Design a protein around this nucleic acid. Sequence first.
RNA 1: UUUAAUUUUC
Length: 360
Amino acid sequence: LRVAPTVVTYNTLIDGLCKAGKLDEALKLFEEMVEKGIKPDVVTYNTLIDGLCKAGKLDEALKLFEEMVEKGIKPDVVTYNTLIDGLCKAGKLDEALKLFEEMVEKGIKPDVVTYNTLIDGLCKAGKLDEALKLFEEMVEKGIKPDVVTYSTLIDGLCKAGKLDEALKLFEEMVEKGIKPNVVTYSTLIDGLCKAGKLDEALKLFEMKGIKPNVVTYNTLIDGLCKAGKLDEALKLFEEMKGIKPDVVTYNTLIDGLCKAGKLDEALKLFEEMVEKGIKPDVVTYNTLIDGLCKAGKLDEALKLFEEMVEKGIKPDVVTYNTLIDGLCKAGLDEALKLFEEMVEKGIKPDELTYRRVVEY
RNA sequence: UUUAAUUUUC
């Protein structure tokens, strides 16, 4: 191997490890390169900063930003976009809108991605009419709205129940010549399904030839289970081909079948999951722990939760919130014992976590 | 190197 390894090799390696998901491996290269005479650059800082935001170490991300500036490695548009996205997705919207101000004070033009990144945050922050302002502002600066832009607004409008305006934006997109893709059509197929418009969802799935992927089939499967067509969704899972089901496919059906009472069927799909080399994440165990609790069967729910940690999947706010619920409803001290444990392990409690225990 | 879609606690 060793030709002098560049910065670009360490930058490829560090990104690769960041996604994913051995972040601790990544940062020891970052050290190992600086001790070797190889100086990290703007892209080396941006990689790690995005790695650390995805792994939810946002506060540790801004440490590295501080460190770049100190070094006189200037943060560029990308560094700022990584930060603006990371802050939105950790719920720091107004922090993120600060950096949007600061970018311009430093002579950095905001981007197509910067506007996309912020229109997304705005939409997900229940602020649609600000999202549509930022969309008016790109055009004012002739930054061409693209397929990620339109797909985001459409998602936005659907998730606010504003379905017939999403449809109206999909039309506009095409006559304006930005072509939809699998993600466009599959947000819309998410829309229509969530508005009880299953026929319409399937009629959009027919899409030019955009090849549906596993997400579009998970949309329809979830659409079918919620509408109570469990065997039409077991059919589509068969299916109407070449798409390998993944972990969400099984969770969606595991939930559908739990809700229905078909706990036999579900658990065999959960047993089938692992035979086919699809590891059960935190949501598979969540979905069942709920099903078992609400079916009155709190013993087996707890079995599953112990087994969770016999395996490697670490619990969740949902895990604890669900068991908290079921434990209290199962006629308190243990519910409260789970709550202490949730604080030691490192998970932060949410409103419901509080709302339940209290309401003692 | 950075942005959009589907699953679990209603």
